[PDB]
């Protein structure tokens with residue numbers, strides 16, 4: 310999958326899926342810029358822009374600055390996100406509000422500052438990282454799954470709005486993935502095997518392929534959706550979860 314010479318932006322690029330994705334675009338030849346709240350590593354194989362995707366003004370400022378110097382934004386990847394868990398009636402107000410400002414507002418702000426650019430150049434590709442929790446109700450994640458469902462719907466209507474301009478807009482929806490947020494947030498030790506088996510009691514199915522996702526495996530799916538191999542694919546959402554939702 311060749312991306313040589315293309316300008317690619319990736320949010321949440323500091324860790325996990327976003328970092329894996331930004332790195333994959335570099336390994337595919339692209340000119341990559343990663344955006345995130347912090348970049349605490351000592352080095353990054355892409356250019357990096359500190360940015361709070363929930364701060365609508367900061368997004369306007371950084372995008373205006375970078376759009377001044379780039380002809381063309383070939384690929385935008387929305388991968389920012391935060392996970393706040395709890396039963397619906399126990400979730401704190403802060404957790405509810407920041408879940409939405411990040412998981413939905415983040416993209417919203419990026420769309421508001423980039424959609425003119427996509428209309429100007431008349432093409433390119435967008436991929437947004439939703440979640441399996443947007444395809445199926447998840448105990449403990451009512452708010453998180455709902456933000457990712459709003460994100461998906463936002464991204465699809467944006468896709469319909471730009472299709473006249475020839476912009477393809479798609480989503481990937483990951484299941485359980487080996488990340489630092491997932492590792493720490495497990496704590497049950499053999500938690501990785503308990504996830505693969507499933508939790509019948511909470512109506513959460515196991516994983517038929519018998520393994521959890523690797524971040525590179527999400528990133529590769531994004532690269533396909535961003536590439537010209539997917540030249541007739543728009544408004545689709547690919548679930549990457551070993552089959553755990555049985556295709557839902």
Ligand SMILES: [Cl-]
Pocket residue numbers: 370371374
């Ligand atoms: Cl700035």
